Design a protein around this motif. Structure first.
Motif, PDB file in Angstrom:
ATOM      1  N   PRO A 124       0.791  -1.231   0.000  1.00  0.00           N
ATOM      2  CA  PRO A 124       0.000   0.000   0.000  1.00  0.00           C
ATOM      3  C   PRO A 124       0.818   1.273   0.000  1.00  0.00           C
ATOM      4  CG  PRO A 124      -0.858  -1.583   1.539  1.00  0.00           C
ATOM      5  CD  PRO A 124       0.445  -2.095   1.135  1.00  0.00           C
ATOM      6  N   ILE A 125       1.952   1.319   0.697  1.00  0.00           N
ATOM      7  CA  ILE A 125       2.733   2.550   0.718  1.00  0.00           C
ATOM      8  C   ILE A 125       3.172   2.901  -0.688  1.00  0.00           C
ATOM      9  CG2 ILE A 125       3.483   2.488   3.096  1.00  0.00           C
ATOM     10  CD1 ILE A 125       6.097   1.039   1.945  1.00  0.00           C
ATOM     11  N   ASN A 126       3.582   1.897  -1.437  1.00  0.00           N
ATOM     12  CA  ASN A 126       4.069   2.084  -2.787  1.00  0.00           C
ATOM     13  C   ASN A 126       2.946   2.262  -3.786  1.00  0.00           C
ATOM     14  OD1 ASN A 126       6.662   2.095  -2.108  1.00  0.00           O
ATOM     15  ND2 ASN A 126       6.937  -0.084  -2.321  1.00  0.00           N
ATOM     16  N   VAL A 127       1.820   1.572  -3.620  1.00  0.00           N
ATOM     17  CA  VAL A 127       0.754   1.801  -4.583  1.00  0.00           C
ATOM     18  C   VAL A 127       0.161   3.178  -4.382  1.00  0.00           C
ATOM     19  CG1 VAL A 127       0.244  -0.636  -4.722  1.00  0.00           C
ATOM     20  CG2 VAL A 127      -1.061   0.775  -3.297  1.00  0.00           C
ATOM     21  N   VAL A 128       0.146   3.683  -3.153  1.00  0.00           N
ATOM     22  CA  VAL A 128      -0.386   5.018  -2.936  1.00  0.00           C
ATOM     23  C   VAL A 128       0.582   6.060  -3.473  1.00  0.00           C
ATOM     24  CG1 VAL A 128       0.480   5.346  -0.625  1.00  0.00           C
ATOM     25  CG2 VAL A 128      -1.472   6.497  -1.283  1.00  0.00           C
ATOM     26  N   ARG A 129       1.887   5.832  -3.325  1.00  0.00           N
ATOM     27  CA  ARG A 129       2.839   6.730  -3.964  1.00  0.00           C
ATOM     28  C   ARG A 129       2.714   6.694  -5.478  1.00  0.00           C
ATOM     29  NH1 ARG A 129       7.685   8.947  -0.958  1.00  0.00           N
ATOM     30  NH2 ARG A 129       7.253   8.291   1.190  1.00  0.00           N
ATOM     31  N   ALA A 130       2.543   5.504  -6.050  1.00  0.00           N
ATOM     32  CA  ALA A 130       2.367   5.355  -7.488  1.00  0.00           C
ATOM     33  C   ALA A 130       1.125   6.070  -7.976  1.00  0.00           C
ATOM     34  CB  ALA A 130       2.286   3.879  -7.840  1.00  0.00           C
ATOM     35  N   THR A 131       0.028   5.964  -7.227  1.00  0.00           N
ATOM     36  CA  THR A 131      -1.226   6.584  -7.625  1.00  0.00           C
ATOM     37  C   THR A 131      -1.143   8.097  -7.546  1.00  0.00           C
ATOM     38  OG1 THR A 131      -2.318   4.649  -6.720  1.00  0.00           O
ATOM     39  CG2 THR A 131      -3.654   6.516  -7.296  1.00  0.00           C
ATOM     40  N   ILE A 132      -0.630   8.622  -6.438  1.00  0.00           N
ATOM     41  CA  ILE A 132      -0.457  10.064  -6.308  1.00  0.00           C
ATOM     42  C   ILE A 132       0.456  10.576  -7.405  1.00  0.00           C
ATOM     43  CG2 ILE A 132       0.377  11.856  -4.814  1.00  0.00           C
ATOM     44  CD1 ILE A 132      -2.202  10.503  -3.958  1.00  0.00           C
ATOM     45  N   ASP A 133       1.514   9.825  -7.702  1.00  0.00           N
ATOM     46  CA  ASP A 133       2.459  10.207  -8.738  1.00  0.00           C
ATOM     47  C   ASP A 133       1.788  10.256 -10.098  1.00  0.00           C
ATOM     48  OD1 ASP A 133       4.654  10.361 -10.536  1.00  0.00           O
ATOM     49  OD2 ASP A 133       4.895   8.179 -10.439  1.00  0.00           O
ATOM     50  N   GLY A 134       1.005   9.236 -10.425  1.00  0.00           N
ATOM     51  CA  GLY A 134       0.310   9.241 -11.694  1.00  0.00           C
ATOM     52  C   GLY A 134      -0.672  10.383 -11.806  1.00  0.00           C
ATOM     53  N   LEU A 135      -1.424  10.641 -10.738  1.00  0.00           N
ATOM     54  CA  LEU A 135      -2.406  11.714 -10.767  1.00  0.00           C
ATOM     55  C   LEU A 135      -1.746  13.070 -10.928  1.00  0.00           C
ATOM     56  CD1 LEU A 135      -5.143  10.618  -8.296  1.00  0.00           C
ATOM     57  CD2 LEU A 135      -4.899  10.255 -10.717  1.00  0.00           C
ATOM     58  N   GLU A 136      -0.618  13.302 -10.255  1.00  0.00           N
ATOM     59  CA  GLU A 136      -0.045  14.640 -10.316  1.00  0.00           C
ATOM     60  C   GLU A 136       0.625  14.921 -11.644  1.00  0.00           C
ATOM     61  OE1 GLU A 136       2.878  15.077  -7.338  1.00  0.00           O
ATOM     62  OE2 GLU A 136       4.277  13.657  -8.248  1.00  0.00           O
ATOM     63  N   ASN A 137       0.882  13.905 -12.445  1.00  0.00           N
ATOM     64  CA  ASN A 137       1.488  14.110 -13.748  1.00  0.00           C
ATOM     65  C   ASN A 137       0.458  14.209 -14.852  1.00  0.00           C
ATOM     66  OD1 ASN A 137       4.046  14.109 -12.689  1.00  0.00           O
ATOM     67  ND2 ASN A 137       4.429  11.948 -13.148  1.00  0.00           N
ATOM     68  N   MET A 138      -0.821  14.183 -14.507  1.00  0.00           N
ATOM     69  CA  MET A 138      -1.872  14.218 -15.506  1.00  0.00           C
ATOM     70  C   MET A 138      -2.009  15.622 -16.064  1.00  0.00           C
ATOM     71  SD  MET A 138      -5.435  12.269 -15.043  1.00  0.00           S
ATOM     72  CE  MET A 138      -6.028  13.481 -13.883  1.00  0.00           C
TER      73      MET A 138
END
Length: 150
Positions: A124-138
């Motif tokens: 979860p720590i990494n999937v949440v970082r991955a998700t936030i990362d993907g969203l902020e690059n949109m």
RNA sequence: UGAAGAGUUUGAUCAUGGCUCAGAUUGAACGCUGGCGGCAGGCCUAACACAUGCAAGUCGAACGGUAACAGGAAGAAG
């Protein structure tokens, strides 16, 4: 208003000189349903303090998401430490079709119409970082038009 | 109109990585239970061996016929 929700909590330990002592980590996500989300990760000797420390960590470190109408601008990819996530926009009336930390981040951030999958390690720590990362690059059409054309 | 994950290796971690679970399905089977209907399906195995009945006849407007049935024409009788 800021939506709050705990993702996970576990019971990390540490071998001390004698026996072994304990802690707790909690992972939380905060957002307002208008394209701002942030996550936090607090450690404490007890669960409630871990959760609170997480919540203040999460209320700072808020990002901006450029949502479209409750869904995403365009399909987006995110990685962090062997955790690859895929989100794409959906149609209205499609829910949050997303997994664990994916669902929670997408919810508190104000998305309702997503079609998401996580591929690598689902820590979860990494999937949440991955998700936030993907969203902020949109990118939304406004800034892509600004940066290149009209 | 379209996509969810969880558990388990460590004292704890993060990776890798397998195992296991949550779904849908069926010519199903079995166990417990069983009201009515509608619509469908029903030897997947031994192309194993098969008692019995039935599953391919029809045409007299092709033909010699006329066994058989029923008629006619009689005959001989009561």
């Amino acid at each position: 208003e800021l939506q709050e929700k705990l993702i996970a909590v576990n019971r990390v330990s540490k071998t001390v000189k004698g026996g072994r002592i304990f802690s707790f980590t909690a992972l939380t996500v905060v957002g307002d349903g208008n394209g701002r989300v942030g996550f936090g990760y607090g450690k404490a000797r007890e669960v409630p303090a871990a959760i609170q420390k997480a919540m203040e960590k999460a209320r700072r470190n808020m990002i901006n998401v450029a949502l479209n109408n409750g869904t995403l601008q365009h399909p987006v990819k995110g990685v962090h430490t062997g955790s690859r996530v895929f989100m794409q926009p959906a149609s209205e009336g499609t829910g949050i079709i997303a997994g664990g930390a994916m669902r929670a981040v997408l919810e508190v951030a104000g998305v309702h119409n997503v079609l998401a999958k996580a591929y690598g390690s689902t820590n979860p720590i990494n999937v949440v970082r991955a998700t936030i990362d993907g969203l902020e690059n949109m990118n939304s059409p406004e800034m892509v038009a600004a940066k290149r054309g009209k």
